[PDB]
Design a binder for this molecule. Sequence first.
Ligand SMILES: COc1ccccc1NC(=O)c1ccc(NC(=O)CCc2nc3ccccc3c(=O)[nH]2)cc1
Ligand SMILES: [Zn+2]
Length: 212
Amino acid sequence: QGTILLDLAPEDKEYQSVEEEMQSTIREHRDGGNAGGIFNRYNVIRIQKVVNKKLRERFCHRQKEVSEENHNHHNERMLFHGSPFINAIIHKGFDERHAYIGGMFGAGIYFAENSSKSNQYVYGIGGGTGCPTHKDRSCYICHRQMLFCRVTLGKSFLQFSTMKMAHAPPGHHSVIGRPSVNGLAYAEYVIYRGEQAYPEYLITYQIMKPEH
Ligand SMILES: COc1ccccc1NC(=O)c1ccc(NC(=O)CCc2nc3ccccc3c(=O)[nH]2)cc1
Ligand SMILES: [Zn+2]
């Protein structure tokens, strides 16, 4: 009836694929790590596959609607997502009704191909006030969660400057905020429909305090 979480064996390719995509997309942000914390490695505590009959159906249906409107190419893409609402997402799915309105490209659901990018949002905008128990944005003790999702982009509208949107532009299904000299440091992917993203993997982890 609800969401089933399947544990993945660290000895299985799927677990391995996910972890590498998460560990190898770490990058230094102009932030100095104030939002997500100072680190260059994560300690993956566990990866669970999210299974929801209903979520999958709304996702797949949305998928061929998008196809009809894009030459039969849904343009699926694996992207990371970080927010203080993961437990709600894995059970009810993404919902644009609880979307970020204070964002670069409006009221959308944001994604990033860089795990360290979503990590800055796991505890709120700018990392908020940090983890729940120690109120520390760079804490290395608490378990953080993030998602590696299937995101249907269809025909994406590409833009450089910050123009607030409420839906995708006509003929499009997503907005990609592209890197600018005076703008973004890395790409962000936006969708204005929850059913365009499926929360495939639940990743529990800790950021790791550096070495030399
Ligand atoms: C209360 O929330 C819910 C309850 C039931 C079902 C769904 C939800 N909420 C959501 O789906 C949801 C969806 C999106 C957000 N917020 C965001 O997308 C912004 C946080 C964020 N921003 C980014 C910007 C650039 C690159 C990556 C990110 C990112 O990972 N997260 C917060 C909540
Ligand atoms: Zn903590």
